[PDB]
């Protein structure tokens, strides 16, 4: 079944690509010219000579070929969808093809035959196989894909059944979608209104069967929303901690039995009943400020087991982008685990749960057991650079030089950057030396650090992650694996900034030195090549994960009155994945070498923002 389905899918994709090529457009234009010339030759009484018969016959052959091609493409689409259904009805080892099945079904929703077959044979498919793509299904209730009411009703029924079977992984998504204007209500096109109404129908349908659970989850969500909307601008000068005012419902919200903590991932089973999950017990009475213009709020929640779990309620910010980033991070980790080449290398991506709650607010999981890179390296009091190289220039001196040179030209900037790097030697190589005295543990941690750096850099380059200064990277004190936490700007946004980001990822001298004597060559280069090969071998899955856009555009876009920049970013991501750029084919080795050269180039590092700490 899988082999037949894969062959049918490949043939359908080949036909679709041929139909979307410029050659097909040229053939269609020639056919239209032939049609209009035949029409003129028929309206006007003209004798049938050799040329007229030849034109008519070649037109008939072209029409027959086009009709046969369309029918064959439809029969391949039907065969591929049917065989995906058959493979997934009673299969477990082939559960990774649900993304291809959903992509084929959603991209061809206009055909009633595939929708009817999906609602007839695929209606009995287990609901636990759509959880990774649950957000993608939840973003398809818009009416822009007018393929009849049958597709909408079958999609709604499937979503309702999935939510009933696994409410933990669905209620937060539906309420977040339905709470787009909740911040404004507590303190918008036709597509948004229709999606909101569909989400409200889903919520009321679920609450018909689980009223207590639904009302408790929405009460917790509203408490988080009001906490995020709370104005803490008067507490910007306090760092020890500020007591939450009693008027907030979060303080009085305690003892939840049917509510599971969102910031902790839940190991989903094949049974629809959950009775061994950590619930919400109480909330702490103090919260801390993490700094910044937006003033994020850090809160601690006590679970059923009594273990405190730190949470970050990032208000006045759009965390939907971070949710997409975490979903693609999990997809990359799963694909790396699936491939036998990377499974042996144990290539993994450190991920933290992000649970959006509204368009302008949300919550995310706090990372524990990690220390900032900048705090470890360039600390004023006990920094690594100060401790190991007192004679070298201090961080304050480097900052002063960078401040004084930003008003100079390219030559002065390059000269001062080269002088700073001359009088500032890397010190990051001593992290594992001073934290792992046992040589075996020291090398194991160093190897894990190098593999994490390579995988994170490759994925960051693919996703266009640009905000990568010292405070956005966290290193674990036990596993020595870098964790990306900020994710605030990505998708090639650094170029929009006044100081363009000339590097794809952070590969500074400290990072290179900490990888060992071999440097970038060796483990880093081989891991980057393996990650690039894995990403290039699953472009359909990566695009499917990223294609959640164009249906529910996030905030900061489509303002000031098929999204423009969402299609631009999809085009750029596809170009990066295919390695085509402006028509030039690049192998995985060549792309890795080019990325390394760009990242380590002092010319590119000189023009970067002084606060990015390129020398560090």
């Amino acid at each position: 079944f899988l082999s037949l389905a894969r062959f049918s899918d490949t043939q359908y994709q080949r036909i679709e690509n041929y139909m979307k090529s410029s050659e097909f457009e040229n053939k269609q234009a020639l056919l239209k010219r032939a049609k209009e010339e035949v029409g003129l030759l028929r309206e006007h009484k003209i004798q049938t000579n050799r040329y007229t018969v030849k034109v008519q016959r070649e037109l008939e052959l072209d029409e027959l070929a086009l009709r046969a091609l369309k029918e064959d493409r439809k029969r391949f689409l039907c065969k591929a969808v049917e065989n995906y259904i058959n493979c997934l009805l009673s299969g477990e080892e082939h559960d990774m093809w649900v993304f291809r099945l959903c992509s084929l079904w959603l991209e061809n929703s206009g055909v009633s035959e595939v929708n009817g077959m999906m609602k007839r044979d695929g209606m009995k498919i287990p609901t636990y196989k759509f959880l990774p793509l649950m957000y993608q299904l939840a973003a398809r209730m818009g009416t822009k894909m007018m393929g009849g009411l049958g597709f909408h009703e079958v999609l709604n029924n499937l979503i309702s059944r999935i939510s009933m079977d696994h409410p933990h992984h669905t209620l937060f998504i539906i309420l977040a979608l339905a709470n787009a204007n909740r911040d404004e209500f507590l303190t918008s096109s036709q597509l948004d209104e229709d999606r909101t109404e569909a989400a409200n129908r889903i919520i009321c349908t679920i609450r018909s069967r689980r009223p207590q659970m639904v009302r408790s989850v929405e009460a917790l969500c509203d408490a988080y929303i009001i906490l995020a909307n709370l104005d803490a601008t008067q507490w910007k000068t306090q760092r020890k901690g500020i007591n939450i005012p009693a008027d907030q419902p979060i303080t009085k919200l305690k003892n939840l039995e049917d509510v599971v903590v969102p910031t902790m991932e839940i190991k989903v089973d094949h049974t629809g009943e959950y009775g061994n999950l950590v619930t919400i017990q109480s909330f702490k009475a103090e919260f801390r400020l993490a700094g910044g213009v937006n003033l994020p709020k850090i809160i601690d929640c006590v679970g059923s087991d009594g273990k405190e779990r730190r949470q970050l309620v990032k208000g006045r910010d759009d965390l939907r982008q971070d949710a997409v980033m975490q979903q693609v991070f999990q997809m990359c980790n799963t694909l790396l685990q699936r491939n036998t080449e990377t499974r042996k290398r144990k290539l993994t991506i450190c991920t933290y749960k992000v649970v959006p709650l509204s368009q302008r607010s949300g919550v995310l999981e706090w990372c524990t057991g990690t220390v900032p890179i900048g705090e470890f390296l360039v600390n004023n009091e006990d920094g690594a650079h100060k401790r190991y190289r007192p004679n070298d220039f201090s961080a304050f001196q480097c900052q002063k030089k960078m401040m004084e040179v930003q008003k100079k030209s390219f030559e002065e900037k390059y000269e001062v950057f080269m002088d700073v790097c001359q009088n500032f030697q890397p010190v990051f190589r001593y992290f594992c030396m001073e934290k792992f005295l046992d040589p075996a543990i020291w090398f194991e941690k160093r190897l894990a650090y190098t593999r994490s750096v390579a995988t994170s850099s490759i994925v960051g380059y693919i996703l266009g992650l640009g905000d990568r200064h010292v405070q956005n990277i966290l290193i674990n004190e036990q596993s020595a694996e870098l964790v990306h936490i900020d994710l605030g700007v990505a998708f090639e946004q650094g170029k929009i900034l006044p100081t363009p980001e000339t590097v794809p990822f952070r590969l500074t001298r400290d990072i290179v030195d900490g990888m060992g004597i071999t440097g970038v060559e060796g483990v880093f280069r081989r891991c980057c090549e393996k990650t690039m090969e894995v990403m290039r071998n699953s472009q359909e899955t990566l695009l499917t994960i990223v294609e959640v856009l164009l249906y529910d555009p996030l905030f900061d876009w489509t303002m000031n009155p098929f999204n423009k920049v969402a299609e631009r970013v999809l085009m750029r991501l596809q170009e990066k994945l295919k390695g085509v750029e402006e028509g030039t084919v690049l192998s995985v080795g060549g792309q890795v070498n080019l990325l390394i050269q760009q990242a380590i180039d002092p010319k590119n590092l000189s023009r970067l923002f002084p606060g990015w700490k390129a020398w560090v």
């Binding site: 910044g292 213009v293 900048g374 900052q399 905000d467 200064h469 010292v470 405070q471 956005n472 900020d486 605030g488 900034l497 006044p498 100081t499 923002f609 606060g611 990015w612 700490k613």
Partner: peptide, 7 residues
């Protein structure tokens, strides 16, 4: 001084 290049 802020580390990130705010807006």
């Amino acid at each position: 001084p802020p580390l990130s290049q705010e807006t």
